[PDB]
Amino acid sequence: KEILEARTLQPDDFEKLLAGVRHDWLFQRLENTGVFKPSQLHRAHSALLLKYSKKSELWTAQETIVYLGDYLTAFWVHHLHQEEILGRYVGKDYKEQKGLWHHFTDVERQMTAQHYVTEFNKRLYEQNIPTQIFYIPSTILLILEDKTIKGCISVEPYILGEFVKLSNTEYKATEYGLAYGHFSYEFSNHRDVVVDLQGWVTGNGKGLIYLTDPQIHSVDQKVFTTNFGKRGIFYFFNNQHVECNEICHRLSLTRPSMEKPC
Amino acid sequence: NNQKVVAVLLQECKQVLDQLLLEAPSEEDKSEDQRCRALLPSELRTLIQEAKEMKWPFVPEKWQYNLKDVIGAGLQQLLASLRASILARDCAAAAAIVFLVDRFLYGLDVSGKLLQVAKGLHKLQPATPIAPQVVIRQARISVNSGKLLKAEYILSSLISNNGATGTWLYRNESDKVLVQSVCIQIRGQILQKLGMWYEAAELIWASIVGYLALPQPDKKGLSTSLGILADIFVSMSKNDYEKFKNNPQINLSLLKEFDHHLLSAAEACKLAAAFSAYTPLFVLTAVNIRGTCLLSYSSSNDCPPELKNLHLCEAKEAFEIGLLTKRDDEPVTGKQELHSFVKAAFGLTTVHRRLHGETGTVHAASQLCKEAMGKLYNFSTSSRSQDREALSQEVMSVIAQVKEHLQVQSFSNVDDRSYVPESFECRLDKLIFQKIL
Ligand SMILES: Nc1ccn([C@@H]2O[C@H](COP(=O)(O)OP(=O)(O)O[C@@H]3O[C@H]([C@@H](O)CO)[C@@H](O)[C@H](O)[C@@H]3O)[C@@H](O)[C@H]2O)c(=O)n1
Numbered sequence A: 001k002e003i004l005e006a007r008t009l010q011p012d013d014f015e016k017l018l019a020g021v022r023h024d025w026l027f028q029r030l031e032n033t034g035v036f037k038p039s040q041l042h043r044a045h046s047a048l049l050l051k052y053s054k055k056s057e058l059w060t061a062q063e064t065i066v067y068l069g070d071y072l073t074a075f076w077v078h079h080l081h082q083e084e085i086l087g088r089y090v091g092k093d094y095k096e097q098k099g100l101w102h103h104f105t106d107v108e109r110q111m112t113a114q115h116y117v118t119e120f121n122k123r124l125y126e127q128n129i130p131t132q133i134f135y136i137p138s139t140i141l142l143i144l145e146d147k148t149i150k151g152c153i154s155v156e157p158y159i160l161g162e163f164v165k166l167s168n169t170e171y172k173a174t175e176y177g178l179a180y181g182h183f184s185y186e187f188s189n190h191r192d193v194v195v196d197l198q199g200w201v202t203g204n205g206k207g208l209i210y211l212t213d214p215q216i217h218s219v220d221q222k223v224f225t226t227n228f229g230k231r232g233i234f235y236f237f238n239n240q241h242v243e244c245n246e247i248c249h250r251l252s253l254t255r256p257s258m259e260k261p262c
Numbered sequence B: 001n002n003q004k005v006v007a008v009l010l011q012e013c014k015q016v017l018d019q020l021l022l023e024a025p026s027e028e029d030k031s032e033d034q035r036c037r038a039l040l041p042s043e044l045r046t047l048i049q050e051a052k053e054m055k056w057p058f059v060p061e062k063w064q065y066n067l068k069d070v071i072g073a074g075l076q077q078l079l080a081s082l083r084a085s086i087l088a089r090d091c092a093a094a095a096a097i098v099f100l101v102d103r104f105l106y107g108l109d110v111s112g113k114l115l116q117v118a119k120g121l122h123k124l125q126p127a128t129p130i131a132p133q134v135v136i137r138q139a140r141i142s143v144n145s146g147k148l149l150k151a152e153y154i155l156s157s158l159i160s161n162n163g164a165t166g167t168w169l170y171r172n173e174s175d176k177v178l179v180q181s182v183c184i185q186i187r188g189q190i191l192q193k194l195g196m197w198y199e200a201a202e203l204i205w206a207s208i209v210g211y212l213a214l215p216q217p218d219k220k221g222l223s224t225s226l227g228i229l230a231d232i233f234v235s236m237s238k239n240d241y242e243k244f245k246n247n248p249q250i251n252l253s254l255l256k257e258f259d260h261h262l263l264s265a266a267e268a269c270k271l272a273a274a275f276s277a278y279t280p281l282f283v284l285t286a287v288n289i290r291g292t293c294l295l296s297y298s299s300s301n302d303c304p305p306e307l308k309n310l311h312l313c314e315a316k317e318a319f320e321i322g323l324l325t326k327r328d329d330e331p332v333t334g335k336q337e338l339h340s341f342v343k344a345a346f347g348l349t350t351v352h353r354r355l356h357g358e359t360g361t362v363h364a365a366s367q368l369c370k371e372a373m374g375k376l377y378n379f380s381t382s383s384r385s386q387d388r389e390a391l392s393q394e395v396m397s398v399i400a401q402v403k404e405h406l407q408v409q410s411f412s413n414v415d416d417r418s419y420v421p422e423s424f425e426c427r428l429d430k431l432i433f434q435k436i437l
């Protein structure tokens, strides 16, 4: 079929992917790949570990081997390029099989949020404020069979905790979340804002929080941004984060000057 | 000697301490303490007396200027003696045993229970000296749990105060410098966890300078700092590395000799392996990272084509060194080490794929690597000692098969104890503190 033709990576594809490819190249390359079946668990597979960097805006591949194990009571994974050998990692595939575009989009979103939160935590540390919220890193595994893509999986470190909405340390989780949204607005040259008030709380409710399902409003529209753009921005500053908190001030975050779009 | 039983025994010790906390001070207790402190081997008794005498801020390692084996051998007896000395109220001997088992139990990832019993001892007798190593362990676990401010408090307190901690009594200034260097290294790790790559590298360089200021350089600390520095170089951006290269206060040969953060990271990995030449697991970890750095560089647009194959051959050597850290029929027990062996095998297979195309030997080695991966997962999933030994054996048999297939030949080092070629120790010599503090 022509789908099988598109799913096969040539030496040139491998060379580009190992050197690092732009978003547009990657997305156009995997256009006629269709939708795959669930990867086969209890098995070792050759694969490409793909990682996205917002700083460089690059997708980079490494050859690896992954073992896919049992579902979590999501399924355990273990490949040869993990950051933590003794650590545990979970992989996940959409229950309804989807295309590669969705996996890559979700990962780009997670890693943009993570970039902003990393800069946020740098600023916090410089100001002697404990780091409280983080983003789980996310990577892609292209499961290959004879140089042919036969699966796509998302990979994350395992986090043991409970899902919360940040409703109910020194500051409330809500204050961290909203201050981080404001920071994303400023640091992004007033072009992005990450809004998410839900995630995995760890350590009997005392420990760190790993945020999930982030929503990124932006004027520079990308595959992973929301449908609202400046609207969303305005909403966040006029309904969600109406007045700043201590964290915003200690970071020297100023109030935006906006007009309700539309 | 399983993490869980040892954790339960440490919880029992801490509960005994909580109990004694509510009571007043029997001859049976001191009899039991003497019995448990006499049942042990004389080496462990000498180590206990040296720790009680505070002759070192850290427990020495063979080849730093085995310990792990003798500690693991008498771990049960050492913990029994610990709880015995606890009943006898000789908190000094209990603290000495804590100092002696601290590093091993960090390896077993139960430092929390040990620090709990340490704080209980301090509660029973606040004057009891506790080794700087244990306080640094508290700082380490604070870093790992994400309490960066608490860890920094502890580390800056130990740095500014010339290593001073509690009622501990140093015996020379070199030990104070060594403690300061370890603390600066952990501060570099703190900044690394936050992604502040440049400042992290600066603190790691300061730790290296401190290590080299000792009368006998700390080769273990140097290997550690250089591995951290390799990781930082990998994580850095071109601009971070350009800025760290042109810093005058940073006189490093690997900087002024390499113009790419991945090549510098690979060189630093070579140095770290050399500095732990007599410890094969650290050699394997460092050379796996070196091969990964070289695989990434040779695959990048920054690598001159004329040089690509050359860097691949470097990767080749790297992985070969890792695979040579063990011999046929030589048992492997750790999960990290088994993983690292599968990693090295697949990295060498990948180097052969990058150099030679889809050959039959490359395909056979890939298949063997997948089989080893399956066995390794089943090893990390099993929970029986015999099942895990058989699985380690099967994994290492597959690794030996990959070595055969890819024609890995040993190197000859005049030092029959070194796990690295002489081309690493060669670089070691020319690597390049008070003003830095
Ligand atoms: N080559 C090498 C060695 C160790 N590691 C890793 O470092 C951490 C911590 O090591 P530790 O042995 O558990 O810490 P100690 O305080 O008990 O010993 C001191 O360690 C430092 C330095 O090597 C590490 O901080 C020395 O300078 C001191 O003299 C003491 O020996 C371990 O997880 C270990 O895996 C490493 O990566 N590489």
Ligand SMILES: [Zn+2]
Pocket: A178, A179, A182, A241, A243, A244, A245, A248, A253
């Ligand atoms: Zn604000």
